[PDB]
Enzyme design. Structure first.
Site, mmCIF file in Angstrom:
data_model
loop_
_atom_site.group_PDB
_atom_site.id
_atom_site.type_symbol
_atom_site.label_atom_id
_atom_site.label_comp_id
_atom_site.label_asym_id
_atom_site.label_seq_id
_atom_site.Cartn_x
_atom_site.Cartn_y
_atom_site.Cartn_z
ATOM 1 N N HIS A 41 0.812 -1.029 -0.060
ATOM 2 C CA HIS A 41 0.043 0.061 0.052
ATOM 3 C C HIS A 41 0.713 1.037 -0.079
ATOM 4 O O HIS A 41 0.310 2.424 -0.148
ATOM 5 C CB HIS A 41 -0.993 0.099 1.066
ATOM 6 C CG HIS A 41 -0.500 0.132 2.402
ATOM 7 N ND1 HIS A 41 -0.246 -1.069 3.356
ATOM 8 C CD2 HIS A 41 0.063 1.365 3.267
ATOM 9 C CE1 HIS A 41 0.020 -0.495 4.415
ATOM 10 N NE2 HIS A 41 0.371 0.943 4.257
ATOM 11 N N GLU A 72 0.925 -8.470 0.724
ATOM 12 C CA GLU A 72 1.159 -6.983 1.189
ATOM 13 C C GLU A 72 2.721 -6.739 1.315
ATOM 14 O O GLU A 72 2.694 -5.703 2.149
ATOM 15 C CB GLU A 72 0.375 -6.782 2.577
ATOM 16 C CG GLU A 72 0.087 -5.257 2.805
ATOM 17 C CD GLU A 72 -0.607 -4.521 1.803
ATOM 18 O OE1 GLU A 72 -1.289 -5.155 0.789
ATOM 19 O OE2 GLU A 72 -0.460 -3.319 1.925
ATOM 20 N N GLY A 146 1.334 5.359 10.935
ATOM 21 C CA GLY A 146 2.877 5.992 11.194
ATOM 22 C C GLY A 146 3.753 4.686 11.392
ATOM 23 O O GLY A 146 4.878 4.977 11.424
ATOM 24 N N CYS A 148 3.293 1.668 9.883
ATOM 25 C CA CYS A 148 3.148 0.639 8.859
ATOM 26 C C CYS A 148 4.770 0.749 8.100
ATOM 27 O O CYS A 148 5.469 1.563 8.093
ATOM 28 C CB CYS A 148 2.203 0.922 7.643
ATOM 29 S SG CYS A 148 0.769 0.646 8.118
#
Length: 182
Positions: A41, A72, A146, A148
């Site tokens: 992402h 991911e 914040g 990730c």
């Protein structure tokens, strides 16, 4: 404060950079040579900022499992003039549960941040922001925006990177040794 935090600090001090994309600032784990990982992402493009320096992306691959399900994790090769310490021997070979994990984050907003998240479950399937996702680890800590890209470690193992939360739980994508064979 103790040996879990010791291992986490040793990883942060040598194997992380601050990555900036158009989608924000991320903790980015460097694994070996010029190869690093970031949550998919982050939407890595042709150019990324690494510790505020404009850096060409030589390759980027959004990993999916052999069911064609999102993992991911994006593996990025950076056009950088320096290699990372090779930490591949700290990656687990198989999917697993863990005790006593630390989530470590280093950004402009959250420098030198270490969180004892405790017990880590092999959660498996998660609908992450509407996207079916596999190989998810879960910990019972109220993680926030914040965090990730943050690194999840135990003593001796680098097991995942933080990719989301639901306000009460946090979720990481597994790192496996097999992602980084060359």
């Amino acid at each position: 404060m103790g040996p879990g935090f010791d291992f986490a600090q040793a990883i942060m001090k040598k194997n992380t950079v601050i990555a900036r994309t158009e989608k924000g600032e991320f903790t980015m784990l460097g694994v070996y040579d010029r190869v690093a990982v970031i949550p998919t992402h982050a939407s890595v493009g042709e150019i990324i900022y690494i510790n505020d320096v404009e850096t060409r992306v030589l390759d980027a691959c959004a990993l999916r499992d052999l069911t064609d399900t999102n993992l991911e994790i994006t593996i990025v090769k950076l056009d950088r003039n320096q290699k990372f310490r090779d930490i591949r021997h700290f990656l687990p070979r198989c999917e697993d549960d863990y005790n006593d994990a630390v989530l470590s984050v280093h950004t402009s907003k959250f420098p030198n941040m270490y969180i004892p998240v405790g017990q880590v479950t092999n959660y498996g399937f998660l609908n992450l922001g509407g996207t079916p996702t596999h190989r998810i680890l879960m910990y019972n800590f109220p993680t926030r925006a914040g965090q990730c890209g943050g690194v999840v470690t135990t003593t001796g193992k680098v097991i995942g990177i933080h990719v989301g939360g639901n306000g009460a739980q946090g979720f990481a994508a597994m790192l496996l040794h097999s992602y980084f064979t060359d």
